[PDB]
Each structure stands twice: as structure tokens, then as C-alpha cells.
Design an enzyme around this catalytic site. Sequence first.
Site, PDB file in Angstrom:
ATOM      1  N   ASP A  68      76.289  31.728  32.620  1.00 33.47           N
ATOM      2  CA  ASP A  68      77.395  32.050  33.555  1.00 33.47           C
ATOM      3  C   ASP A  68      78.778  32.158  32.946  1.00 33.47           C
ATOM      4  OD1 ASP A  68      77.114  29.203  33.406  1.00 33.47           O
ATOM      5  OD2 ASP A  68      78.526  29.006  34.917  1.00 33.47           O
ATOM      6  N   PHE A  94      76.334  22.972  39.232  1.00 33.10           N
ATOM      7  CA  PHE A  94      77.519  22.246  38.781  1.00 33.10           C
ATOM      8  C   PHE A  94      78.659  22.441  39.765  1.00 33.10           C
ATOM      9  CE2 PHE A  94      79.989  20.329  35.327  1.00 33.10           C
ATOM     10  CZ  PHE A  94      81.292  20.625  35.725  1.00 33.10           C
ATOM     11  N   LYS A  98      76.742  28.140  21.216  1.00 29.49           N
ATOM     12  CA  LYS A  98      75.488  28.840  21.441  1.00 29.49           C
ATOM     13  C   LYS A  98      75.281  30.036  20.550  1.00 29.49           C
ATOM     14  CE  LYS A  98      75.273  27.013  26.165  1.00 29.49           C
ATOM     15  NZ  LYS A  98      74.958  27.320  27.579  1.00 29.49           N
ATOM     16  N   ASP A 106      74.033  24.428  33.246  1.00 23.80           N
ATOM     17  CA  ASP A 106      75.048  24.364  34.299  1.00 23.80           C
ATOM     18  C   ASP A 106      75.472  25.794  34.754  1.00 23.80           C
ATOM     19  OD1 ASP A 106      75.433  21.538  34.477  1.00 23.80           O
ATOM     20  OD2 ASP A 106      76.372  21.706  32.472  1.00 23.80           O
ATOM     21  N   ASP A 114      70.710  29.061  30.192  1.00 22.36           N
ATOM     22  CA  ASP A 114      71.746  28.074  30.345  1.00 22.36           C
ATOM     23  C   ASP A 114      71.415  27.070  31.480  1.00 22.36           C
ATOM     24  OD1 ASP A 114      74.395  27.062  29.979  1.00 22.36           O
ATOM     25  OD2 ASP A 114      75.172  28.235  31.657  1.00 22.36           O
ATOM     26  N   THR A 164      72.110  24.230  26.481  1.00 23.73           N
ATOM     27  CA  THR A 164      73.185  23.637  27.260  1.00 23.73           C
ATOM     28  C   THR A 164      74.158  22.940  26.388  1.00 23.73           C
ATOM     29  OG1 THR A 164      73.574  22.233  29.201  1.00 23.73           O
ATOM     30  CG2 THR A 164      71.755  21.644  27.716  1.00 23.73           C
TER      31      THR A 164
HETATM   32  C1  0BT Z   1      80.033  23.720  31.747  1.00 23.03           C
HETATM   33  C2  0BT Z   1      81.275  23.590  32.443  1.00 23.03           C
HETATM   34  C3  0BT Z   1      82.139  22.497  32.221  1.00 23.03           C
HETATM   35  N1  0BT Z   1      83.305  22.367  32.925  1.00 23.03           N
HETATM   36  C4  0BT Z   1      84.251  21.296  32.837  1.00 23.03           C
HETATM   37  C5  0BT Z   1      83.365  20.283  32.173  1.00 23.03           C
HETATM   38  C6  0BT Z   1      84.136  19.800  31.017  1.00 23.03           C
HETATM   39  O1  0BT Z   1      83.389  20.447  29.961  1.00 23.03           O
HETATM   40  C7  0BT Z   1      84.220  20.760  28.895  1.00 23.03           C
HETATM   41  C8  0BT Z   1      83.533  21.634  27.870  1.00 23.03           C
HETATM   42  C9  0BT Z   1      82.147  21.695  27.896  1.00 23.03           C
HETATM   43  C10 0BT Z   1      81.525  22.451  26.906  1.00 23.03           C
HETATM   44  C11 0BT Z   1      82.286  23.166  25.975  1.00 23.03           C
HETATM   45  I1  0BT Z   1      81.369  24.297  24.491  1.00 23.03           I
HETATM   46  C12 0BT Z   1      83.666  23.116  25.951  1.00 23.03           C
HETATM   47  C13 0BT Z   1      84.321  22.336  26.947  1.00 23.03           C
HETATM   48  P1  0BT Z   1      84.652  19.137  27.992  1.00 23.03           P
HETATM   49  O2  0BT Z   1      85.644  19.631  26.940  1.00 23.03           O
HETATM   50  O3  0BT Z   1      83.388  18.648  27.170  1.00 23.03           O
HETATM   51  O4  0BT Z   1      84.940  17.978  28.941  1.00 23.03           O
HETATM   52  O5  0BT Z   1      85.433  21.390  29.234  1.00 23.03           O
HETATM   53  C14 0BT Z   1      86.323  20.649  30.075  1.00 23.03           C
HETATM   54  C15 0BT Z   1      85.524  20.373  31.318  1.00 23.03           C
HETATM   55  O6  0BT Z   1      85.317  21.547  32.041  1.00 23.03           O
HETATM   56  C16 0BT Z   1      83.646  23.385  33.889  1.00 23.03           C
HETATM   57  O7  0BT Z   1      84.664  23.288  34.557  1.00 23.03           O
HETATM   58  N2  0BT Z   1      82.789  24.470  34.164  1.00 23.03           N
HETATM   59  C17 0BT Z   1      81.644  24.538  33.453  1.00 23.03           C
HETATM   60  O8  0BT Z   1      80.909  25.464  33.755  1.00 23.03           O
HETATM   61 MG    MG Z   2      76.850  27.415  32.344  1.00 24.63          MG
END
Ligand code: 0BT
Ligand code: MG
Lengths: 201, 201
Positions: free
Chosen positions: A150, A23, A139, A17, A15, A104
Amino acid sequence: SNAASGGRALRVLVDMDGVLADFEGGFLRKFRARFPDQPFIALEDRRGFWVSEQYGRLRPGLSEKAISIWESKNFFFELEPLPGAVEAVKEMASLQNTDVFICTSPIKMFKYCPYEKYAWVEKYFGPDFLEQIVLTRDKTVVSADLLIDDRPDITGAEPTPSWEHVLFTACHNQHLQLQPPRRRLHSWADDWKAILDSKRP
Amino acid sequence: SNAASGGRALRVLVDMDGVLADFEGGFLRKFRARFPDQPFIALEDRRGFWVSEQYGRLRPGLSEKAISIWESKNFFFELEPLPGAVEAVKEMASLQNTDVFICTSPIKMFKYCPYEKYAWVEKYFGPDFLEQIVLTRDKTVVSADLLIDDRPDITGAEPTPSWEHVLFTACHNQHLQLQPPRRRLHSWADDWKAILDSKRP
Ligand SMILES: Cc1cn([C@H]2C[C@H]3O[C@](c4ccc(I)cc4)(P(=O)(O)O)OC[C@H]3O2)c(=O)[nH]c1=O
Ligand SMILES: [Mg+2]
Ligand SMILES: Cc1cn([C@H]2C[C@H]3O[C@](c4ccc(I)cc4)(P(=O)(O)O)OC[C@H]3O2)c(=O)[nH]c1=O
Ligand SMILES: [Mg+2]
């Protein structure tokens, strides 16, 4: 390194982030810089996977401010690698009969994020490593022996993924009790080679 | 549409370039427009998967000119959909017990291509369809029942992919004899539902 033609290398999905790229620390640094008059959440106090959900409980409107951090240009690109991550993945990729993919999920706002994830991989692993990147929201449809990630609960369209999910310790998951026989990797200092070897025939 | 929780939907990977998006026709149009004094290859005369390899045989230096077309900003974004592609994939995604992913490989120069592939999906299928995109250089590590893809030989790290590769007819593959029992879909007018149904329990 690839198996001999037709042969089957151990396949490891790593992975990005929270495993390769910091992140959470990046987020807090830029949030504090941009919004110095708002309360923040110390990394030690992070609870739950979703940063914006905890910020929203902290104060009305803080969720939208949090989101604006990761939607911004250069947020993904400027993340620092976790200690040991680059070195470990480079070593991992050099091992005989071992295929490493960086797997990712881009965020929903796609203007910068996918691009910057490619650029970040190029910057730390070199142009030839771009062949190893898989971007997906799900994934479970990516087949492998191992997924180091994570996020505690990873589900999707495939109800029985082929990989074993090894939970990579992060500030937001470090107190979680897992269901046996689920395994953790604490950090890249931890013994990732043993985990891989345990999956080899 | 997704299977009931825990259940297993038929999973179909649909390629982008040459299946959804008209890469070959787009390429020729912009090549002719940019390089009006050079010879070109009519779509009917395309041979071999790699456009730049045929252009390079045509005249010294034409390979680099060809490459400059797809490296350019808006090349991917401005591709026209193939006739019937949008309608078919929308129908396909609405079918019970059927999960559709758009599975595409970005080019090496990544400044525009991944971004524009997301934008193109948004433009034709809507924001919620972005959840369905998988970007990968290696489609063999993506597990599914079917892969509809114009590239005749698809190989990678997984020597035994889980999908059946259904060859989608394109100007560059239309004369190829395939090894039985390999199957073709001629175009989106052709009976793609029958192909799917043949994989259902
Ligand atoms: C990867 C990751 C993302 N986020 C933030 C980033 C943004 O990512 C998402 C997100 C990202 C990937 C998935 I699959 C589902 C949701 P967004 O829906 O694309 O904006 O979820 C809301 C937000 O949360 C986090 O807070 N922690 C994380 O570890
Ligand atoms: Mg991650
Ligand atoms: C998808 C596709 C790409 N190309 C061009 C595009 C560019 O794509 C590549 C390509 C794209 C994906 C893979 I996997 C391998 C090679 P580039 O190495 O990224 O630049 O191969 C050389 C070039 O050939 C084609 O000529 N026909 C195609 O159908
Ligand atoms: Mg294609």
C-alpha cells in the site's frame, strides 16, 4: 507451492499493514477509544501515508498521541484482517509454481511489534506459514517478481529492485494518480490472479 | 555508508548466530549450568550444523533438553559477541559505498527470539542500526553481493542467489572441505576488507 527442485517459482511479496492487516481502521478505533475528547481523521479523509503527520497538522500534540496507539501492547496483534486477505493469500500459496512471502517492516519500538506480527501470521495462516515471513525496513533488498504493498513510493538501498510494485489501494492512497505503467490492486476482491499470471513465462 | 542518490553501494549481508553472536558457546554454557548431570559436547568436538542432532545421538532425550536452552527467555539476548565482530561490522558500515545488513533467521518458537535479536543489535550497534536488520528463514530471497554466514549450505526459494556466500568459520564447520571457488572468512581478525574489495568494480 514450491517449484520442482532447482526450478524457479513465481515469487510474490505480500505486505502486511494495509494489505493483510487493517492498520488504519485499527488505529482509528483505538485512538477514538483511548482519546475520546480529541478530534480524529475519518478514513475517507486520510491524506498522505504517515498517520501521525496528518494528526499533528490537526492539533499540536496529536502526533505523539497517535504514536502511542501503535506503540502499545496488542495493537499489532489485534488488527483485523482485511476482507478477503486471508482467503486470497491461502489460495495464492496453494498455486503451482508460486512462492509467497509476507514482507513487513516492524516499527522502531520493537518490544511488541515483531513478536505480534509473528503471532498474527500464526493465528491466521498457521504455524507452517511462519517460514514465509520476512521482516525488513528495506523491501528493495528482497528479490521477487511482485510486491503488493500500500505504500506508494518504496525506495531503499537497491536502486533497481527486482519486483514490480503493485499498489494496494488503501484509504490514504486511493486518490493518487500513478505514473504509467504502474498498476493497482483495489482490494483482495479484485483480480489478483490475473496480475500474477501476467508475470509468468 | 550509502551510495550517492541513485548510486549502487556494495551490499553485504552479515549473519548473526555464529558470526556476530556466540550461539555455540552460549548454548554450551547454559546447557552445562541447567543440566550439570548430563554429558555435553565440547566445542572442539561439534560436528554437523544442528546442535540438537548431535546431542540426540549422544543420549536419548538430550535433543529436547538442548532445544529448551534456546527456547528460553534471554538465551538470544545474553549471547556474547564474537571477538572482533562488533568492531568489524561498525568499521564495515562506515566504509564508503558499503551497505551492511544483519540477516538472521529467527527460530520457530518466536515468543522471545525476534525481540531479543532486535534488543541485542540495539545494545551493540545502537538504535540507528536497527534499520539494517533483516529477519528471514530464507536468505536466498535477500539480494546482495556477499553473505557472510557460518551455515555451510544455504538454499531456499531462489535457486540462483545474487550473493557470494563466504563461509564464516565456526566450531561445527572448521573441518569442512568446500567446493572451489568457495571462500572462508576464519574469524573477524581475518581480512574481511580484502573480501569486500574483491567484489567492488
Ligand atoms: C506501516 C505504517 C506505519 N505508520 C506509522 C507507524 C510508525 O512506523 C514508522 C515506520 C515504519 C516503517 C518504516 I521502513 C519507516 C517508518 P516508525 O519510524 O518505525 O515508528 O513510521 C512512523 C510511524 O508511522 C503509518 O502511519 N502508516 C503505515 O502504513
Ligand atoms: Mg503497508
Ligand atoms: C541458527 C542455528 C540454530 N540451531 C538450532 C536452533 C533451532 O533453529 C532451528 C532453525 C532455525 C532457522 C532455520 I532457516 C531452520 C531451523 P528451529 O527449526 O527454528 O528451532 O532449527 C532447529 C534448532 O537448531 C542450531 O543448532 N545451530 C544454529 O546455528
Ligand atoms: Mg549463523
